[PDB]
Structure 1
Amino acid sequence: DVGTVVGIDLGTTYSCVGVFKNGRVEIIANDQGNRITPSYVAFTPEGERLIGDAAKNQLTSNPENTVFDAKRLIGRTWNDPSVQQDIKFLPFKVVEKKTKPYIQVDIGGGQTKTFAPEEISAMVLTKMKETAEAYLGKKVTHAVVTVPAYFNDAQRQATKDAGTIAGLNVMRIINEPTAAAIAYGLDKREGEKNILVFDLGGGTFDVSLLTIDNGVFEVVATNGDTHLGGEDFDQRVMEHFIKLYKKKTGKDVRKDNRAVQKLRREVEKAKRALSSQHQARIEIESFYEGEDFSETLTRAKFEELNMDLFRSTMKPVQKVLEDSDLKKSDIDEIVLVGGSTRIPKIQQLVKEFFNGKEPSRGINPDEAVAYGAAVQAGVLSG
């Protein structure tokens, strides 16, 4: 009946699925060979739905009908101030329907359709379910799904509802920082500890203070920045190169959406290289007006352009400690989650804040949450 329960991190920008099979957690790659699937859905004018990288890669060509960031809207009402602010930054249409922010898209043949946020998340969960079934060689009916620790009752229920729509019985809703702590085996220890989970992803920043007492977790405080992540650091670098190009050539490349997207792709790759080396060459064939682009970005320049944003991650950490009535020295483990925690300056700032205390390392920060969800899914599969 419940079979092999899957563990899914349903992220704002990226989702990840794991299972417990043959004595260990296995993070599952999708049909594109990727252990992460972008939380994107594109509606083509042929009536087809594209999910994941297939959808993300077609954003520039179909900017009104490619849906992403549905997690920012799920479990909220249309008139929630957070929703009214977020819709200002989203390129697809959002309308009031049944008190909620429904996403409106063209599906071809002169038809437009509206989808609740949980229906978009259900499409992402269906893909995660397909990924898991291809791996296991059998059907998947049950899941453990993670949510941000600050999610309220409506946000947790709407996430279980996205599972129902996808044909998944969401047996447990688990907090993302708790799932990361479980990945590190922090739940399998005698005694009591205070854990700070610092999660800096592609688009969001979450800090959580947890207590662990002989396998029992409590989320004591949460903070962060809802609109700070890796995409913001790429954007600072894009603006930098766009201004330098305008001063050198007198050309504003922002007029050509394709040129901007080629630059975005290469800037993101260069930022990644800058986590292990000190210079990165950005090369673009036929960037603008058919002319090739070839420039270098140093790690020093990358840090300067982003120094305020990197430093900003420190105030939510201090605030969670104040709200927990804990001192820096009371923190027993610092767990880094989210792909942006690979940035050396971010790791430096976290270590400096904690007076030289080394954070927990070793588990891929993009996968730690799904890994913890898979550990719990293994217990439930029996």
Structure 2
Amino acid sequence: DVGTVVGIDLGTTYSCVGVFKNGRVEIIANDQGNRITPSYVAFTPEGERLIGDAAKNQLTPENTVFDAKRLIGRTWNDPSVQQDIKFLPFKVVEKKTKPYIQVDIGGGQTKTFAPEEISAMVLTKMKETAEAYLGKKVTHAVVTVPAYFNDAQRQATKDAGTIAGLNVMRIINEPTAAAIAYGLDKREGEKNILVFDLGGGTFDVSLLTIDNGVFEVVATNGDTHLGGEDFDQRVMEHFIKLYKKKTGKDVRKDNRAVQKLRREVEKAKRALSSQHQARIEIESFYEGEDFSETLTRAKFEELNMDLFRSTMKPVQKVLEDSDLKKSDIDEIVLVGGSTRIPKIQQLVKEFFNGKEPSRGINPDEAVAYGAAVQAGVLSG
């Protein structure tokens, strides 16, 4: 009837899908062998619709859609939308009071998609990912949303699901799913949970309270324009300025050379979470002339220190807005791949006077894991 219910984390930049199979949560890998899929849609001049990794990694930016999560369930005239469309390379128009995305789907053919139709495309990819894994059709799902999502934003995420052919049984808050994944629900008494979520493009701090398996979101903070990509971009600036000093050339003149460096800078960033040095390598790069340079963990930290330190400010504001002190935090939950960064981990620990955060689940998978825990109960 309800079949195997899937747990889907529908993120701004990345998405993740999990299932409960043979007594445990399984985080499913896509057709590219990745356990997280970029929340990207691209259209090639030939007319092919690309979703995920193929859409993000395609060398080309007017016909590449991403960050639909910033527009979903919002009106065109929403000041947040108006501010956001200034940074989006694709066209956004007013249609049916909403911010519809306009793209050439190939051969000069123009189409408009509501932000829930783009999220539906990402959700279809997640569903295809789970169906390939399970060997059968998926009809039902548990989809997570940020704790601050209002009525319209939650309904539009439910609508995205319906378009993708999914019955979104439950909409669950992302920090709550993160807490469920660490088994913080299975505890007795009253506990205060600080969820520190540093994603690809958004930073969210949530103060939750657990009272006998029952969660309550007390206060939320963060910065909607601070995430992992901002860290990639700081590294990008360093290498663009250095290539200017070493060759007198301007890398930014070739868009594909920028995308190549962006992909290499992102791989290097991930490597510096485990090791102390990473090398970037690109052929030919720019004007046939090759690219080979190194990045140290210490330099990455120095290029991003102000952005890293800025994350402590909303943590202070949630504590105040919940009338709590550092001593009142029983559990610290780290969410998002960016929390793998050793300096981010050091900063959060020292802010909580040596208190160690929960560890076990990968922070980039915790929300889909928690969603897959709830999906399991619902599957039976």
* TM-score scaled by length of structure 1: 0.98
Question: Matched residues, percent identical?
Answer: 100
Structure 1: gaps (5+ residues) = none
Moved more, 146-155 or 243-252: 243-252
Taking the aligned partners of 2:32 and 2:301, their CA distance within structure 1 comes to 32
Moved more, 295-304 or 180-189: 295-304
**Is the CA contact 1:208–1:219 (under 8 Å) kept in the aligned structure 2?**
yes
**1:62-85 CA distances to partner (integer Å, 9 max, x unpaired)?**
x11110000000000000010001
**Is the CA contact 2:76–2:99 (under 8 Å) kept in the aligned structure 1?**
yes
Q: How does 1:253-268 map to 2 (within 5 A)?
A: 253-268=251-266
Taking the aligned partners of 2:338 and 2:121, their CA distance within structure 1 comes to 26
Taking the aligned partners of 2:5 and 2:247, their CA distance within structure 1 comes to 57
**Is the CA contact 2:196–2:332 (under 8 Å) kept in the aligned structure 1?**
yes
Taking the aligned partners of 1:59 and 1:164, their CA distance within structure 2 comes to 32
Q: How does 1:131-150 map to 2 (within 5 A)?
A: 131-150=129-148
Moved more, 63-72 or 277-286: 277-286
Shift of 1:113: 0.7
Taking the aligned partners of 1:266 and 1:58, their CA distance within structure 2 comes to 14
Shift of 1:168: 0.6
Shift of 1:124: 0.7
Taking the aligned partners of 2:281 and 2:126, their CA distance within structure 1 comes to 34
Shift of 1:303: 0.9
Q: How does 1:292-371 map to 2 (within 5 A)?
A: 292-371=290-369
**1:274-316 CA distances to partner (integer Å, 9 max, x unpaired)?**
1122222222221211112222212111111111100000000
Shift of 1:56: 0.8
Say which SS state the counterpart of residue 86 (structure 2) adopts.
helix
Say which SS state the counterpart of residue 129 (structure 1) adopts.
helix
**Is the CA contact 2:59–2:259 (under 8 Å) kept in the aligned structure 1?**
no
RMSD: 1.0
**1:40-93 CA distances to partner (integer Å, 9 max, x unpaired)?**
111223332111111111253xx1111000000000000001000110010100
**Is the CA contact 2:162–2:168 (under 8 Å) kept in the aligned structure 1?**
yes
Taking the aligned partners of 1:293 and 1:33, their CA distance within structure 2 comes to 27
Say which SS state the counterpart of residue 324 (structure 1) adopts.
coil
Structure 2: gaps (5+ residues) = none
**Is the CA contact 1:27–1:35 (under 8 Å) kept in the aligned structure 2?**
yes
Moved more, 87-96 or 34-43: 34-43
**Is the CA contact 1:145–1:170 (under 8 Å) kept in the aligned structure 2?**
yes
Shift of 1:192: 1.4
Moved more, 128-137 or 41-50: 41-50
Say which SS state the counterpart of residue 205 (structure 2) adopts.
strand
**Is the CA contact 2:188–2:211 (under 8 Å) kept in the aligned structure 1?**
yes
**Is the CA contact 1:282–1:294 (under 8 Å) kept in the aligned structure 2?**
yes
Over 3 Å counting, the alpha-carbon distance change for 1:285 and 1:45 in structure 2 is closer
User: Which residue does the alignment assign to 1:4?
Assistant: 4
**1:1-47 CA distances to partner (integer Å, 9 max, x unpaired)?**
21111110011111111111111111111111111111111122333
* TM-score scaled by length of structure 2: 0.98
**1:195-233 CA distances to partner (integer Å, 9 max, x unpaired)?**
000000111100100000110000001000101111101
**1:310-365 CA distances to partner (integer Å, 9 max, x unpaired)?**
00000000000000000010000000010000111100110111111111112101
**Is the CA contact 2:59–2:256 (under 8 Å) kept in the aligned structure 1?**
no
Over 3 Å counting, the alpha-carbon distance change for 1:44 and 1:258 in structure 2 is closer
Say which SS state the counterpart of residue 126 (structure 1) adopts.
helix
Say which SS state the counterpart of residue 117 (structure 2) adopts.
helix
Moved more, 266-275 or 325-334: 266-275
Taking the aligned partners of 1:290 and 1:44, their CA distance within structure 2 comes to 26
Over 3 Å counting, the alpha-carbon distance change for 1:276 and 1:108 in structure 2 is closer
**1:133-182 CA distances to partner (integer Å, 9 max, x unpaired)?**
11111111111000000000000000000001111110100000000000
Taking the aligned partners of 1:203 and 1:99, their CA distance within structure 2 comes to 26
Taking the aligned partners of 2:264 and 2:115, their CA distance within structure 1 comes to 31
**Is the CA contact 1:59–1:66 (under 8 Å) kept in the aligned structure 2?**
no
Moved more, 208-217 or 272-281: 272-281
Say which SS state the counterpart of residue 223 (structure 1) adopts.
strand
Shift of 1:109: 3.7
Taking the aligned partners of 1:271 and 1:281, their CA distance within structure 2 comes to 10
Alignment: residue pair count: 380
